[PDB]
Design a protein around this ligand. Structure first.
Ligand SMILES: [Ca+2]
Ligand SMILES: [Ca+2]
Ligand SMILES: [Ca+2]
Length: 376
């Protein structure tokens, strides 16, 4: 069944710690076998619910949080908080939670008046363990001011859906896709984040990102990477549509990964390259709008190169191979060295087909003994 948090003591006066109250309603709904815990408009302050892994509010199978809409319902940490909080709203560790989520609300990590690494949303089973959370759903949710991550769906979630949401002004990445499977990010916006807008890491595969926008972030707009550990490379991922622009680093970074498809996206005004492939295999850059990047350095619009990790976790030398770059409209900025460029670092088997390279110190520059062009 469904409930109203104020029916459990929750005031929402921007001062009173409404944690236990809210959590009660969640428990009630959990007991009833499911349900939508509601919170009317207003500001609900919450304190840490113990240790970092306990977060603030906890969700269990069949429970969802709903508010008066973004900007209307706001769950804000209490001025003065000071401890690592791995998820202001989360699912239990080691507990395979299914059927839960939230919609139409704003989580404010309130980092200006607090200390400790606070992440907005966190869910998952066991990092490095067998099992996962399932069928999660976040909709029209805003996560801002966290000192850490904005949205942190963690290892491992299956069939996750984050749509029409906004992460901004957080300490790290706006949205993280840490080991997600058969999931979807759709029509989301990450901006003003201290690092990446979108960070796809730790073995994520069969994942689709449709119409997402990342701009004004501290590092790259969207990044797909292996991760600090020698885990499986994220793979078979689709980035369809959207725009990644005016970010400090690249628009899109693909580091140590494979079977990635970037298409129909608008990539501009980024500090470094628009799209940078860093030691990835079978990546496809199709029909994208890559223009006016390299705002902070003399780099190419599209950069292809290999990643040496022979001295890192893997001891492997990631060679970028089989990169298909087709039907793109590449246009440079004053500082754009090339439209497309390979580093002579072993990168091979690049396929340049039907590209409109314009306004750059030079269109194409290939090195691999097998890299080819077909009409340009
Ligand atoms: Ca769980
Ligand atoms: Ca580990
Ligand atoms: Ca700020």
């Amino acid at each position: 069944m469904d409930y109203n948090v104020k029916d459990f003591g929750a005031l929402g006066d921007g001062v009173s710690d409404d944690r236990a109250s809210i959590q009660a309603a969640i428990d009630a709904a959990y007991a009833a076998g499911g349900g939508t815990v509601y919170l009317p408009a207003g500001e609900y302050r919450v304190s840490a619910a113990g240790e970092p892994g306990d977060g603030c509010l906890m969700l269990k199978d069949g429970v969802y949080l709903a508010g008066a809409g973004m900007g209307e319902t706001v769950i804000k940490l209490i001025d003065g908080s000071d401890q690592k909080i791995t998820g202001m709203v989360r699912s239990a560790y080691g507990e395979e939670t299914s059927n839960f989520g939230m919609r139409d609300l704003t989580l404010d990590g309130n980092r200006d008046n607090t200390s400790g690494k606070v992440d907005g949303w966190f869910n998952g089973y066991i990092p490095g363990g067998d099992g996962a959370d399932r069928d999660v759903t976040i909709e029209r949710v805003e996560v801002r001011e966290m000192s850490g991550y904005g949205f942190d769906p963690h290892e491992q979630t299956i069939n996750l859906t984050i749509r029409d949401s906004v992460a901004h002004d957080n300490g790290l990445d706006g949205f993280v896709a840490d080991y997600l499977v058969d999931s979807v990010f759709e029509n989301n916006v990450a901006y003003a984040n201290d690092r990446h807008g979108f960070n796809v890491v730790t073995s994520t595969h069969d994942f689709v990102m449709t119409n997402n926008v990342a701009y004004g972030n501290g590092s790259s707009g969207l990044v797909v990477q292996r991760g600090l550990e020698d885990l499986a490379l994220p793979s078979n991922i689709l980035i369809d549509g959207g725009a990644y622009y005016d970010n400090a680093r690249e628009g899109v970074l693909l580091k140590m990964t494979s079977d990635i498809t970037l298409q129909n996206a608008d990539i501009h005004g980024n500090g470094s390259s628009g799209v940078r492939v860093y030691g990835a295999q079978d990546v496809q850059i199709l029909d994208n709008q890559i223009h006016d990047n390299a705002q902070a350095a003399a780099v190419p619009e599209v950069l292809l190169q290999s990643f040496d990790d022979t001295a890192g976790a893997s001891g492997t030398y990631y060679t970028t191979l089989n990169t298909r770059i087709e039907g793109n409209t590449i246009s440079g900025s004053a500082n754009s060295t090339y439209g497309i460029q390979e580093r002579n670092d072993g990168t091979d088997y690049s396929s340049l087909i039907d590209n409109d390279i314009a306004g750059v110190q030079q269109p194409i520059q290939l090195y691999g003994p097998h890299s080819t062009v077909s009409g340009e």
